[PDB]
Short mmCIF file of C-alpha atoms (C1' of nucleotides) in Angstrom, two decimals:
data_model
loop_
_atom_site.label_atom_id
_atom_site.label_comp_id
_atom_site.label_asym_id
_atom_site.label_seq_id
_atom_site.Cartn_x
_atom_site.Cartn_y
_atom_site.Cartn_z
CA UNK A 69 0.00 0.00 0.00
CA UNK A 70 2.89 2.31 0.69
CA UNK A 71 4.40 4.45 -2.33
CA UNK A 72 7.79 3.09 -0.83
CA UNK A 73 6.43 -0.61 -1.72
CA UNK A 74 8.66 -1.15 -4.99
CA UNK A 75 11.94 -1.78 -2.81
CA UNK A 76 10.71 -5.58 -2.92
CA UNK A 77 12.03 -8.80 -4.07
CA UNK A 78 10.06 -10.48 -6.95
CA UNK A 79 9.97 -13.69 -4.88
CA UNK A 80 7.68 -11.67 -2.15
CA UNK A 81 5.05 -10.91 -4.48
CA UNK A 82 4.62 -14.40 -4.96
CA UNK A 83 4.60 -15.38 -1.32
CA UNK A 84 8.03 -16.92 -1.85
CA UNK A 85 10.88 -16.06 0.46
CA UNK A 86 13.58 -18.95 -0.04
CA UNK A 87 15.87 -15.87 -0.76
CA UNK A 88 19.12 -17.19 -2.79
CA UNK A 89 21.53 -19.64 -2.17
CA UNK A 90 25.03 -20.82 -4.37
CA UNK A 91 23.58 -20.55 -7.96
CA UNK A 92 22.22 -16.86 -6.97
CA UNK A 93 23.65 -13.82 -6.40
CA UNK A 94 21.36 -11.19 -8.15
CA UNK A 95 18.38 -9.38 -7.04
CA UNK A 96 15.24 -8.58 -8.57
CA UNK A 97 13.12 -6.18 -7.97
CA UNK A 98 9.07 -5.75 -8.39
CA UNK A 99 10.10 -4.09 -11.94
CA UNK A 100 12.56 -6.12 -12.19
CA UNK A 101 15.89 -4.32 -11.03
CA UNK A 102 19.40 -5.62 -10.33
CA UNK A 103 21.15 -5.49 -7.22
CA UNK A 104 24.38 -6.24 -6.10
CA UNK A 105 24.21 -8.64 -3.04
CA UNK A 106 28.16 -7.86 -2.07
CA UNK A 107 27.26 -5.32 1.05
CA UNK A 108 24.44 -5.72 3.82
CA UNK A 109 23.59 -2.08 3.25
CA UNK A 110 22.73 -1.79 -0.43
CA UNK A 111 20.87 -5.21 0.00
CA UNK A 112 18.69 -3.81 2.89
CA UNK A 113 18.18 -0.49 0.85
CA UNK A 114 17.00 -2.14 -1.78
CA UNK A 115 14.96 -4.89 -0.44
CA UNK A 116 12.56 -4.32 2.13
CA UNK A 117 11.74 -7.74 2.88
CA UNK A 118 15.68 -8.91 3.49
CA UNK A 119 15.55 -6.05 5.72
CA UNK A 120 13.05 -6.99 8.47
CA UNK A 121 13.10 -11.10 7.98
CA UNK A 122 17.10 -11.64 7.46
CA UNK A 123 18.48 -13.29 4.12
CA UNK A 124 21.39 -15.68 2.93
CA UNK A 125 24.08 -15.02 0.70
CA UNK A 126 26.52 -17.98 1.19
CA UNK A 127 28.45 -17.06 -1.91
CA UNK A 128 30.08 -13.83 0.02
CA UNK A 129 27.96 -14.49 3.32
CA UNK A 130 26.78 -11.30 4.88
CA UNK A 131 24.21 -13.17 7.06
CA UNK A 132 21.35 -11.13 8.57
CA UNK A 133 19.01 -12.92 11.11
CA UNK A 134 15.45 -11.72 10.96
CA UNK A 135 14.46 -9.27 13.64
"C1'" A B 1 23.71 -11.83 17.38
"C1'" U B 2 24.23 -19.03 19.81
"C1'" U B 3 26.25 -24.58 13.18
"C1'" G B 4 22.82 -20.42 13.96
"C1'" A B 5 21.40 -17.44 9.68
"C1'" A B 6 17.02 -17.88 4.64
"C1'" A B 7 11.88 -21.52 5.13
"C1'" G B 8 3.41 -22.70 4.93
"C1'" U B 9 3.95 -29.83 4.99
"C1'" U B 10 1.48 -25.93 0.97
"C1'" G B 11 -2.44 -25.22 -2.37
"C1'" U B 12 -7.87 -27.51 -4.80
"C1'" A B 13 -12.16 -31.42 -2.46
"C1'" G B 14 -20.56 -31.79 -0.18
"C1'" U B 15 -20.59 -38.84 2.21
"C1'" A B 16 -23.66 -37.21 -1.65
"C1'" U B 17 -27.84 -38.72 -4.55
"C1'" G B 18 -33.60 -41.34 -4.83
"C1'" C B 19 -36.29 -43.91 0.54
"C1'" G B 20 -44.58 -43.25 3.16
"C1'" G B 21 -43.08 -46.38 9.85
"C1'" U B 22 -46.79 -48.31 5.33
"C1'" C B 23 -51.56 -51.04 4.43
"C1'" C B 24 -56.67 -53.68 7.72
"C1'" U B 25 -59.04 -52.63 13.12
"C1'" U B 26 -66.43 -50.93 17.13
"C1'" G B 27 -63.49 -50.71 23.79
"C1'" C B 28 -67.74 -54.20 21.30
"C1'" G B 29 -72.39 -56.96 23.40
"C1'" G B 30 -76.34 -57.69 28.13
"C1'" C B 31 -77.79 -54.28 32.81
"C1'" U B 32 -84.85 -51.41 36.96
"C1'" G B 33 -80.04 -46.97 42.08
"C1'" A B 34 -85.54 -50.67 42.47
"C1'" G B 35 -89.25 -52.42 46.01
"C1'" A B 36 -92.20 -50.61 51.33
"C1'" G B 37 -93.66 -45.16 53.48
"C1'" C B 38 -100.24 -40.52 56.90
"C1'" A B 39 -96.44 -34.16 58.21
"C1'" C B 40 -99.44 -37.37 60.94
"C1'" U B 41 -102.04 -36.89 65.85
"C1'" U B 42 -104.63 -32.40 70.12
"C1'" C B 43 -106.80 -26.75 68.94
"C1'" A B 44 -113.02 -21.06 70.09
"C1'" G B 45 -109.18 -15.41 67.88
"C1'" G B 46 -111.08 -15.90 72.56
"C1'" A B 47 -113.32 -13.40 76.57
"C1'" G B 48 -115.83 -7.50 78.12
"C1'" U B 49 -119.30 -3.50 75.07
"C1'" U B 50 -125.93 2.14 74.53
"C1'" G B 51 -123.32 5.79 67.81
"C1'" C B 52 -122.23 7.80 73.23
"C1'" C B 53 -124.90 11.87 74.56
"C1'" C B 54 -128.38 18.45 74.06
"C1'" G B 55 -132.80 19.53 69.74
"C1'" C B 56 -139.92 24.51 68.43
"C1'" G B 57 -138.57 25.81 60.12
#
RNA sequence: AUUGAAAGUUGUAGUAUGCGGUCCUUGCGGCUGAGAGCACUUCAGGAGUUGCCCGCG
């Protein structure tokens, strides 16, 4: 509902939530944007949903339990 | 931020459809609350009494 709703991973809009593993390591957005998954801060500023339930990025780590 | 970090044991599904507690059946026939019976027997409205008293068509 929130004009601020586009910072979201594709998976979310379909419920999904598995977020990455080995073979990933590019995000995309609702319109379908790229982002970098090297840094914790770009991926949380991008991604809303990475930001409040954690995510996994075991190709360069930067875990992030959810809150 | 603990060998923990990400995670629906998930989504769709009628025990459902038709199936008479049904058809016949007298609470039926006979039956005296009847026969006997004095509101009878005794009885005065009774005993006293001046329409009373005066009189010129």
């Amino acid at each position: 509902t929130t004009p601020y709703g586009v910072n979201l991973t594709e998976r979310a809009l379909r419920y999904n939530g598995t977020r990455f593993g080995q073979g990933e390591t590019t995000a995309t957005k609702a319109n379908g944007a790229t982002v970098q998954l090297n840094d914790e801060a770009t991926i949380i500023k991008e991604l809303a949903d990475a930001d409040v339930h954690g995510f996994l990025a075991p190709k360069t780590g930067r875990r992030r339990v959810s809150l």
